[PDB]
């Protein structure tokens, strides 16, 4: 079977690589995942579809002029010289009459088109006249704005281009719409001033991969010249997929790798005949495709580093939640509230299971590198501090603990004042000082402290103190204005003084500063690294704040009430313990990260409705009824005893009215 053997054959080829063709794969896959991969499909990818090669056109023109066809191959200059003679001698209406016959044919798209449009390239620069790439984009649900003439540059309907640096036959099969006979190669910069700039900008702002384009081509030579005109290192090195029959001479490779190219050879990766071009293309393309799915992941150091590649950024945060951790692994492991871990489905090696098995045995942790050992010594601490215990299958009697290590949650206002009056050491100190101040009123000072925090983080590359400091300021802005408009119609004379702690000039300062902010756009305005390296810290600045927690909270409450009326029993985790665990997770996260959003109506309603359900279930469990055989079914559980945290939560986010009615009802 083809698929039965090819999957393992690709692995055998991968482990046999020289590791010089492994950094290229790493960089190509990273560019593909970062949206900065651009292909440069040449004139050798369309030949797989049996498209007419240019030499069969020069032969047709040469037949018209010099009687019989030429005896021998054509050089690199006769290609541009024979059609020019035909144009300047035979005419122009006959020049296109042969292009129509040799190009008015529809051919199928080869699988290499799918391989190219499987890494999601940003743009696709091509030098072909056919419509094969456009057709492949059409029948795969990707919209590329086509650019084959100077007048199409300004009218770009979309952002992902399909720039054709050679022309196209959309306007008609005429030689004036394509790059052709030598004159077209001379009056090019004067005839195509915009397309050249777009190509040379996509080359300089993306990672370019060359497919097709046997070495010695005209276009590759021009690109090498232009890159030679570059300064020292501003440009990256374009990759180059060479798929010729014979292997590459070492001298030629040394010559071409000192000019900018990074040649990925195909003949030196597999055994193939002189006319096995499709397999040579597909080997490199399949290695590139199957490297990004982590199929080629075997070693333990790979697993530890990969897990460190999604946990290391989350070190400025003090306690991340568990349901949010599922986003950090691209939906691969359902981190549960109790700390157990499950497998979503998978994509490659089970790195989470390997990490857990490494943590189980000290010897296996000692059977690895030293730097990876230092990484593990931090991953273990982070996972223990964030309530992750084991795999789902290896669960058991989990004594799940909760902790809110924050002065804000425990009152202690004098300690807050003592900390605030003291000087500040680092920006993280100013963040906590601003949060404590906001908890202690004094919002005029808090807004200025947040502004100073935002201004003092200019080149520190610490978005957590920048993304949050703005957001908190927004939440320290609304609470100001929402407070200002409530002291005029309700606090007009409630204290006999019409006390407005904020003056009239400050409210006009914040209006000028906090204007057109559009907090929903802030996450999309951050750098490309922050938009993926901290993708969890996005639900703060939207309407998703406690949104899906309430969406599941309704299901949990309905299930609790149903099991309350069905006279049913519960095993393991229930619809009431999960509510408590989720509520404590959110409560610890918000306070420990010092987010001002823990003082708004949505949170005060969510905690109220959660704890009301918990009290309902506890009181029902205090008066259970004996059954026929259910008397020996639900025993020791007793999972709800109102502790110090419950009491402090049952008197801060809690309302006198409901306690008035819920006490008797």
């Amino acid at each position: 079977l083809e698929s039965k053997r090819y999957g393992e054959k690709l692995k055998e080829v991968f482990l046999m690589l020289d590791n010089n063709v492994v950094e290229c794969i790493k960089e190509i896959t990273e560019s593909s995942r970062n949206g900065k991969l651009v292909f440069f499909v040449g004139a050798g990818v369309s030949t797989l579809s049996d498209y007419p090669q240019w030499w069969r056109l020069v032969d047709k023109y040469h037949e018209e002029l010099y009687g019989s066809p030429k005896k021998g191959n054509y050089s690199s200059d006769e290609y541009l010289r024979i059609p020019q003679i035909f144009y300047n001698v035979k005419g122009e209406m006959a020049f296109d009459g042969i292009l129509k016959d040799f190009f008015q044919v529809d051919k199928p798209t080869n699988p290499i088109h799918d391989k190219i449009l499987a890494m999601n390239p940003a743009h696709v620069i091509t030098t072909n006249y056919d419509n094969l790439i456009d057709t492949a984009c059409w029948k795969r649900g990707k919209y590329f704005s086509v650019i084959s003439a100077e007048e199409d540059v300004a009218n770009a309907t979309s952002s992902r281009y399909l720039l054709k640096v050679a022309g196209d036959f959309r306007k008609g099969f005429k030689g004036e719409n394509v790059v052709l006979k030598e004159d077209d190669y001379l009056n090019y910069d004067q005839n195509y001033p915009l397309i050249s700039n777009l190509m040379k900008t996509i080359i300089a702002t993306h990672t370019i991969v060359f497919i097709g384009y046997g070495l010695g081509d005209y276009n590759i030579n021009m690109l090498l010249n232009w890159v030679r005109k570059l300064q020292k290192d501003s440009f990256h090195k374009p990759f180059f997929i060479r798929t010729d029959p014979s292997p590459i001479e070492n001298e030629t490779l040394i010559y071409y790798e000192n000019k900018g190219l990074r040649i990925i050879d195909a003949a030196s990766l597999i055994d193939s005949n002189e006319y096995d071009y499709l397999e040579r293309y597909s080997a490199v393309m399949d290695l590139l495709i199957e490297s990004q799915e982590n199929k080629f992941i075997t070693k333990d150091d790979e697993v530890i580093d990969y897990i460190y590649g999604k946990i290391s950024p989350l070190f400025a945060l003090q306690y991340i939640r568990k349901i949010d951790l599922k986003h950090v692994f691209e939906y691969d492991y359902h981190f549960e509230v109790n700390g157990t871990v499950v497998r979503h489905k998978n994509k490659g090696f089970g790195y989470m299971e390997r990490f857990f098995e490494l943590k189980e045995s000290c010897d296996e942790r000692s059977k690895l590198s030293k730097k990876q050992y230092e990484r593990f010594n931090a991953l273990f601490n982070f996972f223990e501090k964030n309530g992750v215990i084991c795999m789902a299958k290896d669960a058991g009697t989990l004594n799940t603990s909760i902790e809110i290590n924050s002065l804000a949650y425990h009152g202690k206002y004098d300690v807050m004042k003592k900390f605030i009056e003291e000087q500040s050491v680092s920006i993280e100190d100013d963040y906590k000082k601003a949060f404590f101040l906001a908890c202690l009123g004094r919002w005029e000072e808090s807004y200025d402290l947040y502004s100073n925090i935002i201004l003092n983080s200019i080149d520190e590359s610490n978005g957590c103190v920048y993304y949050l400091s703005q957001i908190n300021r927004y939440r320290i802005y609304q609470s100001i204005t929402q407070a200002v408009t409530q002291f005029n119609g309700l606090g007009l004379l409630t204290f006999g003084r019409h006390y407005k702690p904020f003056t009239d000039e400050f409210l006009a300062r914040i209006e000028r500063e906090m204007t057109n902010f559009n907090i929903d756009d802030l996450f999309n305005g951050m750098p490309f690294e922050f938009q993926k390296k901290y993708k969890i810290l996005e639900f703060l600045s939207d309407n998703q704040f406690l949104y899906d927690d309430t969406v599941k909270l309704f299901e949990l409450t309905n299930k609790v009430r149903s099991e309350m009326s069905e006279g049913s029993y519960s095993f393991g985790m229930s619809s009431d313990i999960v509510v408590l665990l989720r509520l404590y997770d959110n409560l610890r996260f918000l306070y420990e990260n010092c987010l001002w959003s823990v003082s708004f109506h949505e949170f005060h309603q969510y905690i109220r409705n959660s704890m009301s359900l918990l009290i309902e279930k506890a009181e029902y469990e205090r008066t259970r009824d004996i059954d026929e055989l259910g008397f020996s079914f639900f025993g020791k559980k007793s999972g709800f005893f109102m502790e110090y945290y419950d009491f402090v939560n049952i008197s801060r986010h809690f309302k006198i009215d409901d306690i008035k009615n819920l006490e008797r009802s």
């Binding site: 799940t400 603990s401 095993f571 393991g572 059954d627 026929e628 079914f633 999972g639 110090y644």
Partner: protein
């Protein structure tokens, strides 16, 4: 400092004719509903000299995190039936329900199977002759 304590139970569902383990899963909830019905069953005097006690008993069970036995899956996949269930929850009780019926329904989730709905429901089926709904066995604590 709150600390939540959660136990677990293992549910073993198998066939009747052999010891072929149909599958093994967890325990999520159980409902023992014993009650009577509307007045249509018993209206006026009727059987006044001999009042008969009618007891409608239902046993519903739900299991989560279920994986099917590979050997049984292979046997059944390559080309009515009465089954049984065994409980081994913790002391530790050994509850056995014989002649149960597996109900179920198919649900489709937007997020490619968010939580994958691995909930399987069983209903206790009682025949006119068979009477043992559940065998409760207690062992050392």
């Amino acid at each position: 400092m709150k600390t939540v304590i959660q136990d677990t139970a293992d549910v073993y569902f198998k066939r009747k004719s052999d010891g072929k383990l149909v599958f093994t899963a967890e325990a999520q909830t159980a409902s023992f509903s014993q009650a009577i019905s509307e007045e249509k069953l018993r209206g006026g005097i009727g059987n006044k000299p001999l009042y008969i006690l009618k007891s409608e008993k239902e046993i519903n069970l739900t299991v989560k995190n279920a994986f099917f036995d590979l050997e049984w899956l292979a046997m059944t996949q390559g080309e009515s039936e009465r089954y049984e269930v065994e409980y081994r929850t913790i002391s530790d009780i050994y509850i056995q329900f014989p002649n149960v019926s597996p109900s179920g329904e198919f649900e489709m989730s937007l997020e490619n199977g968010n939580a994958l709905a691995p909930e399987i429901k069983f209903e206790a089926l009682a025949d006119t002759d068979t009477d043992e709904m559940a065998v409760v066995i207690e062992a050392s604590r």
